[PDB]
């Protein structure tokens, strides 16, 4: 549980789906 | 009913007293009474609750009373005692026997029995006081008597261990009196107590008693924390009179616990980090030591956060004490992430809890440590980063502010980088590749010193108990 | 502990003592008495006399001189009673600034250092360059990062030249003690 | 490169190739790490039956 | 005074037996070389 | 029972695919009603305590499931107890006659074999553990004690016991002689691989669930498609690219599953994108697999993003060795990655010393640091060296 | 007695070092006497090898040597004839020709071919149909 389970993650949830926005528009 | 109650408990007390009486009468053996006195504290705590207070009344009747005539009456006056016809002169366990403290030779004053009696008499007094939790005049009445009695006796080799445990009750009863009620008389009462500690410590310095000085140093260093004098603590630890040989493991953990808090204000955590770790390894894991393990772990988490390095994260969840370690997790999270508003609201809710352990002042200094740690995190991510790119992350004030905070971080050799203002970016001067330098050789030399250190102590610890088995006759 | 002492000169003399420890750079008694007082909250925050040296020392090691220098010049309480210590406190900062420009900068222009040292003239910066022996090139100040003889104290620990000889001696000495 | 057939490294910025492949050294890490795992299980059987 | 000086001579008697054993333990290793190799 | 506990925990947390909430709610009220287990219908209230998206409607109206009533009642309880109390009367009647007769060790052991399965199907946990103590003394051969290991494993999967179940698993598999028996080694590649998922192993689990025989069908406990799903979980950690193209891609065991069920998108989409080192097609397969595989499974969603962090750092390490210096805008327009999200991805690893990378923001380029160095290997021996000396000093002073 | 109290600590530490280094020296000292006295043990003719057959009321045991024949010698004074039975391999001294100790018993297989197997591995579950 070193540097993993203690702070969990709390990221890459709604920001992962938001990446496809700039991919399907600017391109 | 009450007649048979006094004979049962007193016989068990005399049975334990006669065992240590013949041990000190033959040559010099200082470890024989010590093993019984360890269990005596636990056995007397449960025995004092049973059969009320009537077990210690006839004990004063049995042996001759040098000072104890009026001491037992004043102890029973506060509780408004009833008269059971316990007046001395009824129960007689002596009956003219050599191990019974023969009376005729004692009354004629041709022999001195006061050494092994009066010194042991003060031990049973402090045990009953801690069970009933008596305060105010009863605390000062006992302390005033014991001090002249210790100065009158010569404090022999076996006499130094009798009062060694009495100092712990003197300091404990005085601190609980000040926290319960504060007055002007309690302040001047501690002035005399500070002088008594130094007078007895000088006498014990000649005998070089290991257990006696171990109890004093723990009480003297703790008194300096309430008095607030560093010069008294700094000069005290400079002599290094604390023996590491025969002192108990519980007394060792208390010694290293003070050095961590003393070195914490000197802004040098190199030596203080080892004392807080060694104090945990020398502290038992039982339930009675849980109070020390709780306070020691609270200081350990604060030392690492003040060094600019994140401690072990799994230490909180693996232990079962994390209920009180929850405030320290939000302190580490606020410093690592680098949020300015999160740190302000973190110490606000727990501000009431941080006042008891006096760790709130170390939490105020964590405000600067948020930036000190944040610079080290962003420096490892980007070796070359522009000036305005850092302010967009930690939401700092201006560009000149972040430029001058990096030069302060390299003062202690943390970041180890350079700032180029003409080019406009900060470049890291650490290329690693330390395998070609002599720096790891200095650390490897200490590992050999640590390995051979336990080798010499291995022959001392293992061979010593085998000395008695050679002289004793075997089948 | 004495709770009956209330006066305007009591909090002033205690505040002047904290500025005296920072003048000589004393890390012993300055970081100690903060926890030894009666009020660890109201007197160390709401009171501007006791919190004056606290905000300076906290912002000194922080590295931000923008808001730290304002208390030593434009402050409210630095006029009369605190002005005596402003000479050394501002001198202790510029002594650290001179040592920070050596390691983190090879060369710096005279125009940008004028704002950091809070000087109103370029000749004032060059005045301390000759006293401290700073190499000076055109429109720049060169820093060669000159050190002293050996380091610190405690001989045969990170001190003199040829440390590998003592390292070999550490392997020979403690190896004989194995049999002993 | 990733198949470990020939160890190398490219440069996509300037379109060049730098030096990558280097040999290893035994009796340092791989040999010592395997000994730490074995000694950790042996010491666990010492204080277990010692008390 | 007479019994006080008796303890000082007892410390020297303990030193005579202590210094001889420390020297003997190193000389016993020389006798082991003459023993296991000869037999 | 079938699957032990899966459908009960499918309704615990579901981020997407609301249609699976209806199917999972209809299965928990079906099998339990069809089976003989009385209490396992009551535990539905205790399992969802302190959770987001609870399917139990009592004091909380926030349930988003279509079937909101899992709560225990006395209507189903009275129907299940009538079938449980009727069969135990017939079992205790026939077995009691065999105890007084005492003919052979087979009838004494077989009597408790049918009970060990019966007390598990009537909802008795601790009562079924006492049945193994009587069958242990009645054991005949080594195979008789193996059935005791099955009962410990079956009853241990409900609460996921990693202590007594995992320890007694290797004790029965070893005993005196291990051998190549199919009643031990085959169950060692399955039962032991399950406990490795809860302790976050990913190393020893990749040497069993990945490389093994082609069946391992446990029926009521696990199926073939369930075990084959975890093959891509632990196979992407320890196994390097050399073993990914042999025991994963070209392995004939996973070739038949791709052509059968294409809705997994794990052993196929993730393995092809990782083998090609193409981040353009590797990104869309991360969200599809995380939702339909990691979340529904009980031994996965407990990791979830913890397992996602390991997959992302794998592709960043492969591309790191493919170039020295590259512009940030060039890689952004190549693999189709945003510039803003690029700084957040590399910010969770580089400061943790997971990957060595250098980025120059002045020119907008990324560099490559030395992946392996002699001093970096000795730093790991410092903690391992001092970690051993800590136990030798601490435990050495304790016993004295 | 101030000078005595300063040296009072020397009554223990100096006494311990004499006792601690005693058995440590005696450990190497005994090895010197054991090896030098081994010459008498190496020059000793040794002992024969035999087995017990039968006993009599005269405290004389019949020892059967494997290469040689049978011999009747005297039992050792430490034990008696009640603890000795047939098919028991014992020791026979070469000098005084008497009993020394007991080695072991006779192996389970006897005569030419002897098959003795208790609790075999075959069970009812291992045989189907």
Element containing residue F282 per DSSP (H, E): helix F279-282
Measured CA to CA in angstroms, residue F21 lies from F11, F67, F387 at distances of 6, 8, 48
Helix/strand/coil for F350 = helix
Measured CA to CA in angstroms, residue B314 lies from A4, B335, F306, F391 at distances of 9, 17, 15, 18
Q: List residues bridging with B209 in a β-sheet.
A: none
Interchain contact A/D (3 or more Cβ pairs less than 8 Å)? no
Q: For tokens 């445990």, what's the residue?
A: B165
Distance CA C119, CA C107 (A): 19
Closest CA to F291 of F18, F25, F17: F17
Burial class (CB in 10 A: 0-12, 13-18, 19+), E30: exposed
CB B89 within 8 A of CB B61: yes
CA F360 centroid distance within chain: 42
CA B54 centroid distance within chain: 34
Distance from CA of B28 to the nearest CA of G (A): 9
Residue E32: which of G10, G15, G32 has the nearest Cβ? Answer: G32
According to DSSP, residue C135 is labeled: -
User: CB distance F350–B249 less than 8 Å?
Assistant: no
Q: Which residues of C touch B364 (CB under 8 A)?
A: 58
Interchain contact G/A (3 or more Cβ pairs less than 8 Å)? no
Distance CA F392, CA F229 (A): 43
In sequence order, which residues have a C-beta less than 8 Å from that of residue B259 and are 6 or more positions away?
A: B237, B271, B272, B275
F330 at A interface, C-beta within 8 A: no
Chains touching chain A, criterion 3+ CB pairs below 8 Å: B, F
In sequence order, which residues have a C-beta less than 8 Å from that of residue B251 and are 6 or more positions away?
A: B211, B214, B215, B218
In sequence order, which residues have a C-beta less than 8 Å from that of residue B277 and are 6 or more positions away?
A: B300
* Interface with D, mutate which of F377, F383, F390, F400 (most D CBs under 10 A): F377
* Interface with G, mutate which of B467, B469, B470, B472 (most G CBs under 10 A): B467
Which residue of chain G is at minimal alpha-carbon distance from E12?
A: G14
Q: Which residues of D touch F324 (CB under 8 A)?
A: 9-13, 16, 18
Q: How far apart are the first and last CA of chain G?
A: 99
Which two three-digit tokens encode residue D28? 């340092």
Element containing residue D11 per DSSP (H, E): strand D9-11
F373 at B interface, C-beta within 8 A: yes
Q: What share of chain C is helix, strand, coil (3-state, %, to 5)?
A: 50, 5, 45
Closest CA to G16 of B225, F130, B465: B465
Chain G, 80-99: which have a CB under 8 Å from a chain B CB? Answer: none
CB G21 within 8 A of CB E21: yes
Helix/strand/coil for B385 = strand
CB B13 within 8 A of CB B59: yes
According to DSSP, residue G103 is labeled: E
Q: List residues bridging with G60 in a β-sheet.
A: G74
According to DSSP, residue G76 is labeled: P
Which two three-digit tokens encode residue C116? 């950091």
Task: Count CB pairs under 8 A between chains F and G.
Answer: 13
Q: For tokens 């997790």, what's the residue?
A: B329
Which two three-digit tokens encode residue E11? 């410390």
User: CB distance B454–F351 less than 8 Å?
Assistant: no
Which residue of chain B is at minimal alpha-carbon distance from G22?
A: B467
Q: Which residues of D touch F323 (CB under 8 A)?
A: 9-13
Element containing residue F185 per DSSP (H, E): helix F185-188
CB F132 within 8 A of CB F152: yes
Q: For tokens 């001179």, what's the residue?
A: C98
In sequence order, which residues have a C-beta less than 8 Å from that of residue B314 and are 6 or more positions away?
A: A1, A2, A5, A6
Q: List residues bridging with G102 in a β-sheet.
A: G90
Distance CA B434, CA B446 (A): 18
DSSP assignment of B113-139: -HHHHHHHHHHHHHHHHHHHT--THHH
CB B427 within 8 A of CB B383: yes
The stretches of B1-113 forming alpha helices (DSSP H) are 2-25, 32-49, 57-62, 71-77, 103-107
CB C15 within 8 A of CB C3: no
Distance CA B447, CA B452 (A): 9
According to DSSP, residue B306 is labeled: T
Closest CA to B450 of B278, B219, B269, B279: B278
Which two three-digit tokens encode residue G101? 């100790």
Distance CA C100, CA C98 (A): 6
Which residue of chain E is at minimal alpha-carbon distance from G32?
A: E32
Strand order of the β-sheet with C136-137 is C107-109, C140-142, C136-137
The sign of the torsion formed by the CA atoms of F334, F335, F337, F342 equals: negative
Burial class (CB in 10 A: 0-12, 13-18, 19+), F355: middle
User: CB distance B467–G2 less than 8 Å?
Assistant: no
Q: List residues bridging with F357 in a β-sheet.
A: F368
Which two three-digit tokens encode residue B53? 């207070």
Burial class (CB in 10 A: 0-12, 13-18, 19+), G109: exposed
CB F272 within 8 A of CB F262: no
Question: How many other CB atoms sit within 10 Å of the CB of residue F135?
Answer: 21
Which two three-digit tokens encode residue B350? 């727990």
Distance CA F146, CA F173 (A): 8
Question: How many other CB atoms sit within 10 Å of the CB of residue F263?
Answer: 8
Element containing residue B314 per DSSP (H, E): helix B314-318
Q: How far apart are the first and last CA of chain A?
A: 41
Distance CA F7, CA F23 (A): 9
Q: What share of chain D is helix, strand, coil (3-state, %, to 5)?
A: 35, 10, 50
Distance CA G86, CA G91 (A): 14
In sequence order, which residues have a C-beta less than 8 Å from that of residue D30 and are 6 or more positions away?
A: D24
A1 at B interface, C-beta within 8 A: yes
DSSP assignment of A1-27: -TTSTTT----SSHHHHTHHHHHTT--
Closest CA to E17 of G20, B23, F197, B299: G20
Element containing residue B154 per DSSP (H, E): none
Distance from CA of B463 to the nearest CA of G (A): 6
∠ Cα G111 G116 G121 (to 5°): 155
Distance CA D1, CA B263 (A): 53
* Interface with B, mutate which of G1, G6, G19, G29 (most B CBs under 10 A): G19
Q: List residues bridging with C63 in a β-sheet.
A: none
The sign of the torsion formed by the CA atoms of B210, B212, B213, B217 equals: positive
In sequence order, which residues have a C-beta less than 8 Å from that of residue F84 and are 6 or more positions away?
A: F36, F38, F122, F123
Tell me whether strands F365-368 and F357-360 are parallel, antiparallel or unpaired: antiparallel
CB F15 within 8 A of CB F295: yes
Burial class (CB in 10 A: 0-12, 13-18, 19+), B111: exposed
Which residue of chain F is at minimal alpha-carbon distance from B390?
A: F361
Half-sphere exposure of C129 (CA within 13 A, CB side): 19
Closest CA to F342 of F353, F327, F332, F355: F332
Distance CA F270, CA F260 (A): 17
Which two three-digit tokens encode residue F231? 């093959």
Measured CA to CA in angstroms, residue B327 lies from B157, B302, F178 at distances of 49, 11, 51
Residue B425: which of F362, F367, F374 has the nearest Cβ? Answer: F362
Distance CA C126, CA B95 (A): 100
Which residue of chain F is at minimal alpha-carbon distance from A6?
A: F306
Distance from CA of F132 to the nearest CA of A (A): 36
CB C58 within 8 A of CB B368: yes
Phi, psi of B391 (to 5 degrees): -65, -25
CA B172 centroid distance within chain: 12
Measured CA to CA in angstroms, residue F293 lies from F44, F222, F267, F297, F298 at distances of 23, 16, 11, 6, 10
Phi, psi of B134 (to 5 degrees): -100, 140
The resolution in angstroms reads 3.8
Which residue of chain C is at minimal alpha-carbon distance from B444?
A: C167
Q: For tokens 């050394």, what's the residue?
A: C88
Closest CA to F3 of F297, F398, F376: F297
User: CB distance G21–E25 less than 8 Å?
Assistant: yes
In sequence order, which residues have a C-beta less than 8 Å from that of residue F198 and are 6 or more positions away?
A: F160, F162, F299, F302
Element containing residue D16 per DSSP (H, E): strand D16-18
Distance from CA of E14 to the nearest CA of G (A): 6
The sign of the torsion formed by the CA atoms of F171, F176, F180, F181 equals: negative
The stretches of chain C forming alpha helices (DSSP H) are 8-23, 51-62, 86-104, 110-116, 122-131, 164-176
Contact residues of B toward A, CB < 8 A = 312-314, 316-318, 329, 333
Q: List residues bridging with G52 in a β-sheet.
A: G63, G88
Q: For tokens 């290329």, what's the residue?
A: B431
Distance CA B223, CA E24 (A): 51
């Amino acid at each position: 549980e070193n540097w993993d389970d203690v702070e969990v993650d709390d990221d890459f949830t709604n920001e992962l789906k938001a990446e496809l926005d700039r991919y399907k528009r600017e391109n | 009913l009450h007649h048979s109650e006094k004979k049962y408990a007193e016989e068990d007390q005399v049975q334990e007293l006669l065992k240590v009486l013949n041990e000190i009468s033959k040559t010099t053996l200082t470890l024989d009474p010590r093993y019984i006195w360890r269990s005596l504290k636990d056995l007397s705590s449960l025995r004092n609750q049973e059969l009320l207070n009537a077990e210690t009344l006839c004990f004063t009747v049995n042996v001759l009373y040098p000072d104890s005539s009026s001491f037992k009456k004043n102890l029973l006056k506060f509780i408004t005692s009833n008269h059971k016809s316990s007046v001395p002169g009824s129960a007689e366990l002596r009956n003219s026997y050599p191990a019974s403290f023969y009376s005729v030779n004692t009354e004629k004053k041709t022999i001195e029995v006061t050494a092994e009696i009066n010194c042991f008499m003060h031990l049973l007094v402090q045990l009953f006081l801690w069970d009933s939790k008596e305060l105010e005049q009863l605390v000062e009445f006992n302390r005033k008597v014991v001090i002249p009695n210790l100065l009158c006796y010569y404090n022999l080799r076996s006499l130094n261990l009798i009062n060694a445990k009495l100092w712990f009750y003197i300091y404990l009863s005085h601190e609980t009196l000040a926290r319960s009620s504060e007055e002007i008389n309690s302040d001047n009462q501690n002035i005399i107590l500070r002088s008594t500690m130094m007078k007895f410590l000088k006498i014990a310095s000649l005998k070089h008693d290991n257990e006696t000085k171990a109890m004093l140093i723990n009480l003297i260093l703790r008194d300096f924390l309430n008095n607030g004098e560093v010069d008294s603590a700094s000069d005290f630890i400079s002599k290094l009179e604390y023996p590491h040989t025969d002192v108990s493991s519980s007394l060792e953990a208390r010694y290293f616990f003070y050095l961590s808090k003393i070195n914490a204000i000197q802004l040098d955590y190199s030596t203080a980090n080892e004392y807080i770790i060694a104090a945990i390894r020398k502290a038992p894991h039982n339930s009675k030591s849980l109070g020390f393990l709780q306070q020691s772990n609270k200081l350990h988490c604060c030392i690492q956060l003040l060094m600019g390095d994140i401690p072990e994260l799994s230490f909180f969840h693996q232990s079962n004490m994390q209920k009180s370690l929850l405030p320290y997790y939000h302190l580490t999270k606020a410093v690592k992430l680098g949020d300015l508003k999160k740190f302000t609201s973190t110490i606000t809710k727990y501000k009431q809890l941080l006042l008891k352990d006096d760790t709130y002042q170390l939490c105020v200094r964590l405000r600067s440590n948020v930036i000190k740690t944040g610079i080290r995190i962003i420096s490892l991510t980007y070796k070359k980063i522009s000036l305005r790119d850092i302010c967009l992350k930690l939401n700092l004030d201006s560009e000149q502010t972040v430029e001058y905070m990096v030069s302060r971080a390299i003062r202690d050799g943390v970041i180890e980088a350079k700032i180029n203002h003409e080019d406009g970016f900060i470049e890291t001067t650490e290329l690693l590749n330390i395998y070609d330098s002599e720096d790891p050789q200095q650390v490897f030399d200490e590992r050999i010193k640590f390995a051979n250190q336990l080798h010499d102590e291995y022959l001392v610890s293992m061979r010593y108990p085998e000395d008695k088995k050679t002289q004793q006759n075997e089948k | 502990n004495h709770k009956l002492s209330e006066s305007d000169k009591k909090s002033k003399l205690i505040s002047l003592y904290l500025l005296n420890l920072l003048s000589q750079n004393n890390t012993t008694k300055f970081h100690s008495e903060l926890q030894y007082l009666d009020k660890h909250i109201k007197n160390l925050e709401d009171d501007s006399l006791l919190s004056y040296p606290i905000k300076l020392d906290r912002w000194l090691m922080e590295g931000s001189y923008q808001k730290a220098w304002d208390l030593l010049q434009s402050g409210s309480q630095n006029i009369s009673e605190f002005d005596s210590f402003t000479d050394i406190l501002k001198s202790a900062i510029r002594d650290e600034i001179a040592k920070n420009t050596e390691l983190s900068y090879d060369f710096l222009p005279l125009s940008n250092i004028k704002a950091l040292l809070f000087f109103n003239n370029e000749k004032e910066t060059e005045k301390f360059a000759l006293e401290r022996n700073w190499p000076i090139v055109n429109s720049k100040v060169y820093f060669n990062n000159q050190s002293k003889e050996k380091a610190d104290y405690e001989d045969e620990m990170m001190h003199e030249e040829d440390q590998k000889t003592n390292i070999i001696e550490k392997a020979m000495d403690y190896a004989i003690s194995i049999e002993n | 490169i990733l198949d470990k057939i020939f160890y190398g490294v490219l440069d996509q910025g300037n379109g060049w190739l730098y030096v990558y492949e280097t040999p290893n050294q035994d009796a340092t890490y791989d040999s010592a790490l395997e000994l730490v795992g074995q000694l950790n299980k042996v010491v666990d059987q010492l204080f277990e039956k010692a008390s | 005074y007479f019994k006080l000086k008796k303890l000082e001579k007892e410390y020297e008697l303990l030193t005579l037996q202590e210094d001889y054993i420390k020297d003997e333990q190193r000389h016993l290793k020389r006798e082991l070389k003459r023993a296991q190799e000869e037999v | 029972n079938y699957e032990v506990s899966e459908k009960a925990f499918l309704l615990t947390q579901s981020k997407v695919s609301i249609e699976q909430r209806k199917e999972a709610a209809e299965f928990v009220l079906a099998k339990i009603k069809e089976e003989e287990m009385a209490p396992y219908y009551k535990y539905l209230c205790e399992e969802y305590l302190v959770n987001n998206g609870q399917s139990d409607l009592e004091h909380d109206e926030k349930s988003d499931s279509l079937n909101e009533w899992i709560k225990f009642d006395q209507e189903l309880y009275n129907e299940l107890c009538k079938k449980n109390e009727s069969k135990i009367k017939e079992l205790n009647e026939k077995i009691q006659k065999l105890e007084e007769d005492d003919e052979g060790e087979l009838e004494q052991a077989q009597a408790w074999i049918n009970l060990g399965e019966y007390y598990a199907q009537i909802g008795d946990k601790d009562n079924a553990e006492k049945t193994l103590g009587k069958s242990l003394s009645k054991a005949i051969s080594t195979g008789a004690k193996i059935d005791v290991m099955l009962t410990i494993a079956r009853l241990g999967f409900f609460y996921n016991d990693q202590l007594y179940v995992k320890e007694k698993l290797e004790a029965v598999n070893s005993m005196i002689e291990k051998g190549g028996d199919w009643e031990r080694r085959n169950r060692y590649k399955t039962y032991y691989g399950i406990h490795c998922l809860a302790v976050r192993n990913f190393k020893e689990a990749a040497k069993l669930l990945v490389d093994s025989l082609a069946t391992f069908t446990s029926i009521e406990l696990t199926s073939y498609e369930s075990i084959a799903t975890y093959a891509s979980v632990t196979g992407l950690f320890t196994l390097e690219r050399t073993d990914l193209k042999s025991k994963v891609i070209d392995s004939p065991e996973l070739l038949s599953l791709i052509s059968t069920t294409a809705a997994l998108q794990s052993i196929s989409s993730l393995t092809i994108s990782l083998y090609a080192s193409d981040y353009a097609s590797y990104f869309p397969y991360l969200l599809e697999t995380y939702a339909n595989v990691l979340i529904p499974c009980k031994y996965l969603n407990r990791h979830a993003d913890f397992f996602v962090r390991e997959m992302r750092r794998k592709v960043y390490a492969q591309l790191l060795e493919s170039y020295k210096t590259l512009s940030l805008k060039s890689m952004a327009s190549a693999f189709g990655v945003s510039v803003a999200f690029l700084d957040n991805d590399l910010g969770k690893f580089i400061p943790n010393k997971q990957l060595n990378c250098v980025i120059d923001r002045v020119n907008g380029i990324v560099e490559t640091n030395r992946p392996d160095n002699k001093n970096a290997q000795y730093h790991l021996l410092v903690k391992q060296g001092d970690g051993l000396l800590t136990k030798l000093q601490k435990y050495g002073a304790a016993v004295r | 007695e101030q000078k005595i109290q300063e040296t009072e600590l020397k009554i223990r530490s100096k006494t311990e070092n004499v006792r601690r280094l005693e058995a440590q020296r005696n450990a190497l000292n005994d090895k010197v006497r054991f090896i030098k006295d081994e010459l008498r043990l190496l020059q000793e003719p040794g002992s024969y090898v035999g087995e017990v057959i039968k006993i009599v009321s005269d405290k004389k045991v019949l020892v059967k040597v494997q290469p040689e024949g049978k011999y009747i010698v005297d039992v050792a004074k430490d034990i008696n004839v009640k603890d000795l039975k047939a098919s028991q391999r014992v020791c026979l001294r070469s000098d005084s020709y008497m009993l020394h100790k007991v080695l072991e018993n006779k192996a389970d297989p006897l005569v030419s071919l002897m098959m003795v197997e208790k609790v075999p591995d075959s069970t009812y579950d291992m045989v189907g149909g």
